[PDB]
Amino acid sequence: MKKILIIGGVAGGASAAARARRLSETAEIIMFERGEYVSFANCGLPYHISGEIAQRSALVLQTPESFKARFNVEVRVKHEVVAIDRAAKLVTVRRLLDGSEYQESYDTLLLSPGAAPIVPPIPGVDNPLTHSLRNIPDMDRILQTIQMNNVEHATVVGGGFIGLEMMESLHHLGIKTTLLELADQVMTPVDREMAGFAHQAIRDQGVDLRLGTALSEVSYQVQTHVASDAAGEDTAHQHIKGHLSLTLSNGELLETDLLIMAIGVRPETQLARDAGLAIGELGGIKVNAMMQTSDPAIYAVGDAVEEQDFVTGQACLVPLAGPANRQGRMAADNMFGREERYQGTQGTAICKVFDLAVGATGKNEKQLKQAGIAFEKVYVHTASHASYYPGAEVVSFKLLFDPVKGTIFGAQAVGKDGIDKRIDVMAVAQRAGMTVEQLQHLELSYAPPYGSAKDVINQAAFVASNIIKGDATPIHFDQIDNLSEDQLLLDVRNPGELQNGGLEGAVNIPVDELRDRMHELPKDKEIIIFCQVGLRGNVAYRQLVNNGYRARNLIGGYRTYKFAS
Amino acid sequence: MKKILIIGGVAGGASAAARARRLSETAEIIMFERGEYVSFANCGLPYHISGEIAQRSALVLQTPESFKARFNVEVRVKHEVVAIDRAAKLVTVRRLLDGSEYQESYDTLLLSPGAAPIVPPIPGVDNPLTHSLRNIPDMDRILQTIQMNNVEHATVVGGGFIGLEMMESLHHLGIKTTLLELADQVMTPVDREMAGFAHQAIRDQGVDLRLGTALSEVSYQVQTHVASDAAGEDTAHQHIKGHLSLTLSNGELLETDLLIMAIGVRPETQLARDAGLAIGELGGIKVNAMMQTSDPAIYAVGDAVEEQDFVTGQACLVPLAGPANRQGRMAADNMFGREERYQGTQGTAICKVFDLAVGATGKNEKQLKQAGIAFEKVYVHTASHASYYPGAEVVSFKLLFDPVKGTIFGAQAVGKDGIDKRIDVMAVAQRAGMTVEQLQHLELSYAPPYGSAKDVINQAAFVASNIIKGDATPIHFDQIDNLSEDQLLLDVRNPGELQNGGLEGAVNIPVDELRDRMHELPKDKEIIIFCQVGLRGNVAYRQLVNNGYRARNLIGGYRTYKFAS
Ligand SMILES: Cc1cc2nc3c(=O)[nH]c(=O)nc-3n(C[C@H](O)[C@H](O)[C@H](O)COP(=O)(O)OP(=O)(O)OC[C@H]3O[C@@H](n4cnc5c(N)ncnc54)[C@H](O)[C@@H]3O)c2cc1C
Ligand SMILES: Cc1cc2nc3c(=O)[nH]c(=O)nc-3n(C[C@H](O)[C@H](O)[C@H](O)COP(=O)(O)OP(=O)(O)OC[C@H]3O[C@@H](n4cnc5c(N)ncnc54)[C@H](O)[C@@H]3O)c2cc1C
Ligand SMILES: CC(C)(COP(=O)(O)OP(=O)(O)OC[C@H]1O[C@@H](n2cnc3c(N)ncnc32)[C@H](O)[C@@H]1OP(=O)(O)O)[C@@H](O)C(=O)NCCC(=O)NCCS
Ligand SMILES: CC(C)(COP(=O)(O)OP(=O)(O)OC[C@H]1O[C@@H](n2cnc3c(N)ncnc32)[C@H](O)[C@@H]1OP(=O)(O)O)[C@@H](O)C(=O)NCCC(=O)NCCS
Numbered sequence A, B: 001m002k003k004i005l006i007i008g009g010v011a012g013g014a015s016a017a018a019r020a021r022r023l024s025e026t027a028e029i030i031m032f033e034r035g036e037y038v039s040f041a042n043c044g045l046p047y048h049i050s051g052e053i054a055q056r057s058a059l060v061l062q063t064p065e066s067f068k069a070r071f072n073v074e075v076r077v078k079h080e081v082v083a084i085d086r087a088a089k090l091v092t093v094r095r096l097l098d099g100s101e102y103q104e105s106y107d108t109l110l111l112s113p114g115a116a117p118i119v120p121p122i123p124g125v126d127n128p129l130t131h132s133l134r135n136i137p138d139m140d141r142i143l144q145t146i147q148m149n150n151v152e153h154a155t156v157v158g159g160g161f162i163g164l165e166m167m168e169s170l171h172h173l174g175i176k177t178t179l180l181e182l183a184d185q186v187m188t189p190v191d192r193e194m195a196g197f198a199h200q201a202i203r204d205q206g207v208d209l210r211l212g213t214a215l216s217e218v219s220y221q222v223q224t225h226v227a228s229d230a231a232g233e234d235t236a237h238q239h240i241k242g243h244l245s246l247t248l249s250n251g252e253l254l255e256t257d258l259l260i261m262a263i264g265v266r267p268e269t270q271l272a273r274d275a276g277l278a279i280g281e282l283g284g285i286k287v288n289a290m291m292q293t294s295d296p297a298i299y300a301v302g303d304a305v306e307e308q309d310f311v312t313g314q315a316c317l318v319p320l321a322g323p324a325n326r327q328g329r330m331a332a333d334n335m336f337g338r339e340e341r342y343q344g345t346q347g348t349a350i351c352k353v354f355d356l357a358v359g360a361t362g363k364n365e366k367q368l369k370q371a372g373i374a375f376e377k378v379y380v381h382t383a384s385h386a387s388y389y390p391g392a393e394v395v396s397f398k399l400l401f402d403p404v405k406g407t408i409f410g411a412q413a414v415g416k417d418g419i420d421k422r423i424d425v426m427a428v429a430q431r432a433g434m435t436v437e438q439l440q441h442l443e444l445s446y447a448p449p450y451g452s453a454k455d456v457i458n459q460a461a462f463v464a465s466n467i468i469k470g471d472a473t474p475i476h477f478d479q480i481d482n483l484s485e486d487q488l489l490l491d492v493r494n495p496g497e498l499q500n501g502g503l504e505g506a507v508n509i510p511v512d513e514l515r516d517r518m519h520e521l522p523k524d525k526e527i528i529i530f531c532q533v534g535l536r537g538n539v540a541y542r543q544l545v546n547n548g549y550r551a552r553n554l555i556g557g558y559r560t561y562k563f564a565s
């Protein structure tokens, strides 16, 4: 009978524990968790903060006693593993209740410790008004400061998903908020010009967003003076637990009631470095594709481990829940000798940003420029369903691919509806190895409430494949401010549309009058075309090229240019 | 120049005509449409009847004048092609206004004439209160009877997509409705036990639904008496345009103010039969995969043409707008010599049924049995996003597959949320050639407002792969009422649930007490196991099989069984 020990009782480890029991009734299974709870909803925590998850009880999916009754697994809460002795096959655990220790033997071990929020070397950061959010007790501490310091202004630092969901939760509660990010964008899985849609939705809601900005120093000032109604002062905007004074990278001062630090997570590697297990160059535990670590008796999975990038095959860190549940179930397999291989990670993700969703899968343009992978890019801005049926919303969509083989590198989407469906389709298509050209032949669901005769994805294909075939020639948003004396700029929108914004120096010929009015444009210039989203631009480009003109169409049209600035 | 003539100015014909112009400015393009409108939204028609789509101008996407301006195509409204002389490369054209006819020559011709509603051989069916729905003027006639006949009760015949949409539209107007279907189910793209979810939701809204029934005779009675207020009569529930009395196949009479006939459509083939063109055994125009008919200078696409079934490679009839628009695009390519080949049709479809959507891709169980293909099926009933975040809904989902090769045959889903996204994923997965074993590694979008750590699709994959690998042994809803003396029925729900329905003779041991209570079950019988959905049943199965019992799990649990009756 195999004695199995599991370190961590959440997404990785709880999922191996239940799987391993279905596989064998004879094994001994013991799962350690240093916290009070197992199988809690990490992803739910900012939503319980704002009240959107009304019921604390809903964040707890399994208990020690339920794991015992259903799966016979002995789960020990408030028990922290403090060492692994590999030659002996024993682990030392500490009982947090009283600080005593004992040892336990294993036949095989699974490490599933996750990743801890990043500590930044900021003077004065460590203080009673400053918190990071990983678990339920972190959430209760945040709640308790909100109540007790009567929070009216708050600052979040970092524009990744945890930061944006804290920001949104704080705003749900009536709190005035400021978000700082050092980058020139929120959410880094999406490129800069796609993040612009998010920046404007965030500023439309009264949030003070400051990009390109760092937090230099934190000054915590204890409240010395308790105002009171018996002294006849105003006690409504009082903060009894103190005040934060922040210095920013540009010497400005920001006064605040609460600071939340959401600048990312680092893998939990201390038990593994202390036992001599291999660490990768990203600082995560190194595992083979069977999820085994340098020691064949020891497995690891989840936030703590490095994975293989699906597109490139290189190491990457991607702390998401999906991969961690399916890795733990596969480790349980392999611990009974199935020899199953995990198939790489795409980084499929999505985040709510007030009324928008922001979604992506595979590689963005920054990661491709930086690894020297040649690529091309397309944008469309296409209704989430038939436009003649109410509630349709613009889906802004980006597609990164190899301009020659048609390989799918990545996809990004942004809008108020149907983004979770476009990113799922592209995730499936890429994982199954489809190329752009094949994307053209997708037969998706169409009735008017749900979709359109040609889907967002079909239109993106045709635009990408037209470039690959040489039936289209592009000019991107970043090239169009910089024209040469051989290029003539041409706006093919209608004249009423021009008061929304255009580009300095365009001649205006509306697409519907172009055929007739053509001789107006000299054939000794490369005509550089744009419309609102790139579609009327394409029509104009075909008429010009069909009559012997040299031409280019701005992909994404003015809408992509305008959100990119 | 190449001279191109198109018959039909809707989904197939229009898409060819705009594409053909982006390919060539020197081509001559003429498109004939027998009616008043080109590029209308067929699919929006029932929704404008209900007022959903408020504006009669939202149904019109291009005009003759817009197609002249944008694409220099000459469109001729109220011109019907009445003959094709293939040998001469001339068509004969009748001018509606006049009845005058002329000839027009062509280098290449596209037939995209659509499919007309089926005429049933029913005595008295042709009358002023009875209509089917193909185009804008069909729609205007329906609205006009509704108004003029003060419609308070109506009958719809046929339970496919148009029937179900007209029934919803009429209910949305406060009209009492009856739906009659000869089959034992609405929506034949999904099997009978999936349609039961739809049967209940339609009777829940007070629609009088009569399955297994036909309409044998229609008797139309003019109204002789005009009730008047001056005569001191109630004028409120009068129908001055008359009354319908229907006789059904069981001999019952049905009294109604309006009859809608939605029993299917049949390809327009008369021009093609008259010209000598080949026609398949299903009665559609026969084409190769480049969209060319038995005459190489003549192309055909859309509702009029038999297609190649993706899964089996045989002929099928599938009148849907996605296919029609992409085929007409491709036909234009081919006419300029690109030799592109379509790739088969999956029959991806979705229909709104009150708050449910009912969707499907691939083959159903009916079509598999009939064609003698060996298959297996799984069911799952999984929350549409993390059920700890509000608004999550049950997605009932069926997967059809090859139990040894893992080939994906079909998928079906019904429920209040997220059905479009599940069906698009499976349509992507099957068109790309993925197997059920590969679906287990799908990495989808998860954030609590949208998805779950394991999606509906990961769960279905795991359940089916377990069967394929011999880790599960299924019994289905249609076998469980049998049972021999070698079999013993076990219900592993909690006692409290037996309250909502069960199976007679079951011995109740709840799964969380089963490990301890298990000596109660004798080893010399195969234990036949059931819970609500099949998830707890799986866990009970693994416990018994792991202790040397013979066992089966009821796949889909009691839920799937309940909705099959
Ligand atoms: C606020 C927030 C929102 C999130 N939103 C999403 C989302 O929307 N979508 C998504 O895909 N992902 C999301 N995630 C990330 C997701 O929570 C993780 O990626 C997944 O939980 C990783 O599982 P894990 O088992 O590796 O680690 P964890 O869930 O962190 O579990 C590890 C457990 O190990 C315990 N432990 C560590 N060391 C020891 C020790 N030595 N002895 C005993 N116990 C130990 C810890 O206390 C911890 O409870 C979110 C995370 C947070 C914090
Ligand atoms: C009420 C309704 C709801 C629908 N909903 C959906 C849905 O939700 N999803 C979906 O995928 N599909 C739906 N459809 C079906 C979809 O509309 C068809 O699949 C598609 O329009 C077929 O395109 P087509 O070009 O073959 O035919 P059509 O669009 O019917 O166009 C053919 C044209 O040919 C003309 N014509 C015929 N013969 C001649 C001739 N001799 N000379 C000149 N003109 C001629 C006709 O008058 C017609 O206007 C719906 C259809 C209806 C009727
Ligand atoms: C819940 C948890 C304990 C896993 O328990 P589990 O019993 O493996 O999980 P599920 O409820 O998902 O059940 C899956 C099993 O049911 C089976 N199944 C699912 N639906 C079924 C159905 N309708 N009929 C038959 N079997 C079904 C599956 O095949 C699977 O079993 P398998 O792995 O042996 O193939 C673990 O995921 C967890 O603790 N999650 C919460 C913590 C977390 O993930 N947080 C991350 C941040 S949100
Ligand atoms: C509208 C209709 C006339 C076709 O016109 P169309 O110009 O081909 O159609 P679209 O608007 O979808 O445009 C697609 C073209 O724009 C291009 N495109 C789409 N978005 C683009 C973008 N933002 N930038 C550059 N090009 C873009 C596509 O590549 C494509 O050109 P291509 O075929 O040469 O590759 C025909 O579809 C129709 O009449 N529809 C209504 C009738 C109907 O289908 N009803 C049946 C069921 S409701």
Ligand SMILES: [Cl-]
Binding pocket: A531, A532, A533, A534, A535, A536, A537, A557
């Ligand atoms: Cl445009």
Ligand SMILES: [Cl-]
Binding pocket: B531, B532, B533, B534, B535, B536, B537, B557
């Ligand atoms: Cl169940």
